[PDB]
Amino acid sequence: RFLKVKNWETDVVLTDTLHLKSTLETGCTEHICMGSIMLPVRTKDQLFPLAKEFLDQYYSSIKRFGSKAHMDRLEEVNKEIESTSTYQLKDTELIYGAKHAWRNASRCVGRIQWSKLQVFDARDCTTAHGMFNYICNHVKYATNKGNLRSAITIFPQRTDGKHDFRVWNSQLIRYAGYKQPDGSTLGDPANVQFTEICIQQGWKAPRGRFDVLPLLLQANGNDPELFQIPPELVLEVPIRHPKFDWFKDLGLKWYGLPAVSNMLLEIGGLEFSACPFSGWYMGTEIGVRDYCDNSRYNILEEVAKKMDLDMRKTSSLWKDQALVEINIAVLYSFQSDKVTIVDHHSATESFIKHMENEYRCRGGCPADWVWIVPPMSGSITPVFHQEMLNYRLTPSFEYQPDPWNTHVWKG
């Protein structure tokens, strides 16, 4: 079965065969589309074909499919599964797996970079202190004084689901949020619940608007432990505007390194529940979502006031106007401080070329339009006009439940 996608701006038509390799379910049926829904202990029984599928992919990629090395490896894994009920990935397979999970991430606009990913093997890690050490090294390497480098650090895979390694933070670097008695929120409202946990765990909160959260790290299924990232490792950028000088006095800054730490990495049926990864920011992540979402820092009004816009009618588009200036400021501040960032025009144009390249070399590129299209200025980016096919390939990054809801407390 062949499937066609059309760019309605260029009339470029692409053919997808890659979707045939898809196994996992989408959430959709012939009767309903769940394309806009945010989120729609494994036996030896199910595990071997998953290993086999992966190793078949891996060995094809290296042009050794059906080789003796291929065959012996399958043999080795089968035996190791039935003997030990799981198996260990070679370093080569781990690196291949991590890169392909990123490559397969249909919601990621930055995938043109997928083959440049620094993989840190942390499978020899046993304690939370060991995790802190690995994470510091990741942050230092990835930050690279502003010249960001994509990286991922991979802790030991799940075994019985009772000894999971987990990073309790959603991102390695993130600002605290504090609910006040008056109902107002100080800092990042997105992080109130997690901040509360940290505090309960013993964190002494400065209670400021931009307090970098401590790391809450769980090794081998034990209770999580608190650590503070050395501040000298946390690269931050003061936000100013190139024309508006009052903008600095808004008191805004952000961190340079976006590093998602709550996802699960699946490779050949193995589950890596702690696999923090990092790239660099697209400007709108901060300027549109982090700053301007009503449920986040929500600075639209204060900015618009300071710009003296007509705020009595939405049809003045005062919100749209303030939104643009803020995003200009975010990009200006990062570029000025030589911290890697990409605007949403550059990023989406790159994605289209990547996607076209993927269709030719790979036979497809799964993509989630709802997520690929930037949260401002949608149709003046080329992805808006691009038809996309969303489907699930493995290796993959998956959501997992927040550890505080599942964790069995030792005390």
Ligand X SMILES: C[C@H](O)[C@H](O)[C@H]1CNc2nc(N)[nH]c(=O)c2N1
Ligand Y SMILES: Nc1ccc2ccc(CNCCCc3cncc(F)c3)cc2n1
Contacts of ligand HEM in 258-287 (CB under 6 A): 277, 279-280, 282, 285
- List 130's β-bridge partners, or say none: none
User: CA-CA-CA-CA torsion for 269, 371, 145, 97, nearest 10 degrees?
Assistant: 20
Q: Which of 53, 285, 349, 398 is catalytic?
A: 285
Annotated catalytic residue, options 93, 102, 103, 111? 111
Of 3 and 199, the one with the shorter C-beta distance to Zn ion is 3
Tell me the C-alpha distance between 218 and 126, whole Å: 10
Residue 292 binds ligand HEM, judged by CB under 6 A = no
Contacts of 231 (CB under 8 A, 6+ apart): 212
Say which of 108, 125, 198, 292 is annotated catalytic.
Answer: 108
Q: What is the CA radius of gyration of the chain?
A: 23
What is the spatial distance between Cα 38 and Cα 410, in angstroms, rounded to a whole number? Answer: 33
Per CB under 5 A, contacts with Zn ion among 63-92 are: none
Q: Which of 89, 229, 93, 261 is nearest to 165 (CA)?
A: 261
Which DSSP category does 292 fall into?
H
Answer yes or no: 292 catalytic. no
CB of 7 to ligand X, least distance (A): 8
> Nearest distance from residue 279's CB to ligand HEM, in Å?
3
Residue 141, helix vs strand vs coil: helix
Residue 371 interacting entry, from ligand X, Zn ion, a copy of itself, none, C-beta within 5 to 8 Å by type: ligand X
Annotation says 365 is catalytic: no
Angle between helices 44-61 and 68-84 (to 10 degrees): 160
Q: Which amino acid is it at 152?
A: I
Site residues for ligand Y, 274-313, by CB under 6 A, read: 279, 281-282, 285
In sequence order, the 6+-apart residues with CB closer than 8 A to the CB of 280 are 148, 150, 256, 257, 258, 340, 341, 342
Answer yes or no: is 335 a known binding residue.
no
- CB–CB of 283/327 below 8 Å? yes
62 touches a copy of itself by CB under 8 A: no
Q: Does 258 bind ligand Y (CB under 6 A)?
A: yes
- Indicate which of ligand X, ligand HEM, a copy of itself, none lies near residue 113 (CB less than 5 to 8 Å, by partner kind): ligand HEM
Binding site for ligand Y (CB under 6 A): 38-39, 110, 258, 260, 279, 281-282, 285, 399
Binding site for a copy of itself (CB under 8 A): 3, 5-6, 8-9, 19, 22-23, 25-38, 283, 288-289, 292-295, 300, 314-317, 319-321, 323-324, 327-328, 331-332, 335, 343, 345-346, 368-370, 373-380, 384-391
